[PDB]
Amino acid sequence: PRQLHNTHWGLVCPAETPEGQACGLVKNLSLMSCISVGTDPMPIITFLSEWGMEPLEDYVPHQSPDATRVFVNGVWHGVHRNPARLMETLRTLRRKGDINPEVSMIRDIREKELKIFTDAGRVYRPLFIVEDDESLGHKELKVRKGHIAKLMATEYQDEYTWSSLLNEGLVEYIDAEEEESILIAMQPEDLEPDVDPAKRIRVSHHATTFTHCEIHPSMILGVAASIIPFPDHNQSP
C-alpha cells in the first residue's frame, strides 16, 4: 500500500507524500485528476441489447466460444459476437456526449471481455485523442491549431471551452482501468513520421498504434511539487 505503484501515473503525485508513519498512505491528486461522481447504467444497458448483446439467459457456450462477455459495474449482462462494432459505437457515443464522459469502457481483446463502469470513486485524467480519421498524413492528434485559436480567443475575451473540447471528441477522460488498453504518446511531436549534446537523451517514436497523447507530462505532479523548479534535475527524495 505505501509503495508508489505504476498505475499511479497521472492520477496521484509521485513526490508529495509525508515522511515517516503516513508515508505512502497519505497521497495527493495530480493537477489534472478528477474523481467520478456517479451515473445511471440503465441507458447503456438498454443500448447494449439494442445492439445485439445476447442475454445471458439464452447463452450457450459450447455453441459460441468466441463470444465476448460484457459486464457493467461488475454485473455480467450477457454476451456479444463481433464486439468490435459495438465498441466503436460506444466510444463515439461517449465522445459526442450521449454517454457521460465520466463513464469508463474497456475492451480486452485477447481476454474476450468488455467492461463498463458507471460508479463513483473512480479516479481519472484527461488525454488528447489520437485517432487517424485524418487523411493528409497519418495518425494525428484531433486538436488542431484552429481549436487552440478558439480556446485562446475565449481567454483574451476576459465561447469555446474545455467542455467544447470534450463534446467535439478532442479529449477524453481516462481511468487506470481503461488506461490498460491504450498506448499513449508522451509528446505530441513524437507522432512525427546533428543532435544538441546539451539536451537530455530521449527515446524514439516506434509507434503507429498511438490512441492518445499526454496533454503535458508535468501534470503527473501535484500542487506542492508543481512549485519545485527543475524537479527533473533533483534526486527523487
Residue numbers 60-99 binding other proteins by CB under 8 A: 61-62, 65-66, 69, 73-76, 83-84
Residue 228 in the binding site for other proteins (CB under 8 A): no
Residue 100 in the binding site for other proteins (CB under 8 A): no
CA distance 78 to 147: 40
The answer to whether 118 and 111 have CB atoms below 8 angstroms apart is: no
Q: Which of 148, 149, 133, 132 is nearest to 191 (CA)?
A: 132
Residue 5 in the binding site for other proteins (CB under 8 A): yes
Residue 171 in the binding site for other proteins (CB under 8 A): yes
The answer to whether 30 and 10 have CB atoms below 8 angstroms apart is: yes
Residue 194 in the binding site for other proteins (CB under 8 A): no
Q: Cell 455453441, residue?
A: 63
Q: Which of 156, 159, 160, 155 is nearest to 170 (CA)?
A: 160
Q: Quick one: which of 194, 199, 227, 229 contacts other proteins (CB under 8 A)? A: 199
Q: Quick one: which of 157, 203, 227, 229 contacts other proteins (CB under 8 A)? A: 203
CA distance 51 to 12: 37
Q: What are phi and psi of 69, to 5 degrees?
A: -95, 140
Q: Which three cell numbers stand for residue 85?
A: 462494432
Using the contact rule CB under 8 A, the part of the chain among 43-51, 93-101, 123-131 near other proteins is 123-131
Output the smallest distance, CB 174 to other proteins, in A. Answer: 9
Residue 211 in the binding site for other proteins (CB under 8 A): yes
Output the smallest distance, CB 165 to other proteins, in A. Answer: 7
The identity of residue 60, as a single letter, is V
Residue 229 in the binding site for other proteins (CB under 8 A): no
CA distance 221 to 231: 10
Q: Quick one: which of 42, 46, 186, 228 contacts other proteins (CB under 8 A)? A: 186
The identity of residue 210, as a single letter, is F
Output the smallest distance, CB 153 to other proteins, in A. Answer: 10
Q: Quick one: which of 51, 89, 98, 183 contacts other proteins (CB under 8 A)? A: 183
Q: Cell 508515508, residue?
A: 23
Q: Quick one: which of 121, 156, 157, 229 contacts other proteins (CB under 8 A)? A: 121
Using the contact rule CB under 8 A, the part of the chain among 42-50, 89-97, 193-201 near other proteins is 193-201
Residue 196 in the binding site for other proteins (CB under 8 A): no
Q: What are phi and psi of 152, to 5 degrees?
A: -65, -20
